[PDB]
Amino acid sequence: KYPPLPVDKLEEEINRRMADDNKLFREEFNALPACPIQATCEAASKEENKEKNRYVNILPYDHSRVHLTPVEGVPDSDYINASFINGYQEKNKFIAAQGPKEETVNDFWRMIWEQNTATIVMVTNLKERKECKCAQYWPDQGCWTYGNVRVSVEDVTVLVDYTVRKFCIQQQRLITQFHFTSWPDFGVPFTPIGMLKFLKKVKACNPQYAGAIVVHCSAGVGRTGTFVVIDAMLDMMHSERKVDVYGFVSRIRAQRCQMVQTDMQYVFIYQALLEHYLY
């Protein structure tokens, strides 16, 4: 049993669970159900959609997958590797999406438009140890038409741990991309500070009356899940001065598989929570 932790007991529990090389934390992460409910991935498993997925095992569930309005003339264009994710007290706040492939860049932009998304959170660098982990779905400068969506760069602000890019999409809307560049090729960041500042700004800039926020990494589950869970727990920590990491992760796993891929990511969430509480 992993009951919600009152903030006054957060630090001691973290120390207790970090003891013996994160023994208890690892047990907690392992105690997490692969999926609390029964789901299917039929749409993602379709022959015609096989090249739209980065990995054969990281597929979205049918009930929570983001459906795209089919492009006339192109059957199966309703599919995209992305799932609707709930925030603390916000049903369908995020869209955990897979980083687009060369073949899915247009689908990715269609989603941004159709969902009336105003904020995109990218938690990966385009390349890691020589491999393309995400297709650059945006021009460096100037304009370019991806399918039926015209995209132009309006501004690029490079900060310490992240870069903010402003895009003008059409077919107008100004969307902001928060690109976290400080995530290491292996493990998690040495300190949660960078992610907290990143989270802080995204919360402050995302419009109150806009569509779902698109968060994505390579597979769209790992660092994406870490971001979502931290966000949710920060809200919960303000709303009822308590945190329920286990419960929340268990719940969102019913929407998308492997939300929070590693045990180190799990521990990172807790440490981020503590860092913000203590400040």
Residues within the annotated binding site for substrate? 185, 217-223, 261
Cβ distance 130 to 185 under 8 Å?
no
Q: Are strands 90-97 and 213-216 parallel, antiparallel or unpaired?
A: parallel
239-263 in b/e burial notation, b at 16+ Cβ within 10 A?
Answer: eeebbbbbebbbbbbbbbbbbbbbb
Look up residue 119 and give its two tokens. Answer: 């904020």
The DSSP call for residue 197 is H
Q: How far is CA 42 from CA 132, 161, 164, in A?
A: 27, 38, 36
Q: Which of 35, 134, 168, 217 is catalytic?
A: 217
The structure was resolved to a resolution in Å of: 2.2
For residues 131 and 133, give the distance between their C-alpha atoms in angstroms, rounded to a whole number: 6
For residues 48 and 272, give the distance between their C-alpha atoms in angstroms, rounded to a whole number: 41
Q: Within 129-205, where are the H helices?
A: 193-205
3-class secondary-structure state, position 31: helix
For residues 265 and 227, give the distance between their C-alpha atoms in angstroms, rounded to a whole number: 10
From the number of C-beta atoms within 10 Å of its C-beta (0-12, 13-18, 19+), residue 230 rates as: buried
Taken in order 44, 46, 47, 49, the sign of the CA dihedral is negative
Per the listing, tokens 């995020």 go with: 94
For residues 255 and 231, give the distance between their C-alpha atoms in angstroms, rounded to a whole number: 17
Catalytic residue status for 205: no
Q: Are strands 119-122 and 213-216 parallel, antiparallel or unpaired?
A: parallel
Taken in order 45, 51, 52, 53, the sign of the CA dihedral is positive
Q: In the CATH scheme, what architecture does the domain 1-279 have?
A: Alpha-Beta Complex (3.90)
Q: Within the chain, where are the H helices?
A: 10-31, 105-114, 193-205, 222-239, 245-252, 263-278
Phi first, then psi: give them for residue 114, nearest 5 degrees.
-55, -40
Per the listing, tokens 């440490």 go with: 271
For residues 175 and 165, give the distance between their C-alpha atoms in angstroms, rounded to a whole number: 8
Beta bridge partners, 96, equal: 83, 215
The DSSP call for residue 69 is P
- The contacts of residue 15 (CB under 8 Å, 6+ apart) are none
For residues 60 and 73, give the distance between their C-alpha atoms in angstroms, rounded to a whole number: 24
Q: Name the region of 120 (left: φ>0; alpha: ψ -120 to 50; beta: rest).
A: beta
For residues 119 and 215, give the distance between their C-alpha atoms in angstroms, rounded to a whole number: 8
Taken in order 19, 20, 24, 29, the sign of the CA dihedral is positive
For residues 146 and 235, give the distance between their C-alpha atoms in angstroms, rounded to a whole number: 36
